[PDB]
Each structure stands twice: as C-alpha cells, then as structure tokens.
Amino acid sequence: AITPEQIAVEYPIPTYRFVVSVGDEQIPFNNVSGLDVHYDVIEYKDGIG
C-alpha cells in the first residue's frame, strides 16, 4: 500500500516531463542536454614524497 503523496516525496523523478524558459519566454523543446560542471586539478609534488 503506497499512497500517491508518498511517491511524490520518496520516488525518483523521470526525465520526460519538463518546461524550458528562454529569457522571459517559455518555448517547448524536445531535448535538452549538456548541463555539466567541470573543474581542473592542480597538483604539486615534492622531494620527500
């Protein structure tokens, strides 16, 4: 016995229902991708390990 309110709180969300706002206007889209964040790594080694 699982109530719909439980699903809205505990279950993971699917990808297929979304709304996209471009500027101050909303436009229907079919696919949106690429929202990734990347960082570089700076390293430093010394003689004593």
List of residues contacting other proteins (CB under 8 A): 45-47
How far, in Å, CA of 27 to CA of 19, rounded? 8
- As beta bridge partners, residue 25 has 22
Tokens (6 digits) for 16: 């297929």
Report the distance separating Cα 11 and Cα 33, nearest Å.
23
In the complex with other proteins, the residue whose CB is nearer, 4 or 47, is: 47
Q: Least distance from C-beta 22 to other proteins, angstroms?
A: 47
Q: How far is the CB of 48 from other proteins (least distance, A)?
A: 9
Beta carbon of residue 46, minimum distance to other proteins (angstroms, whole number): 5
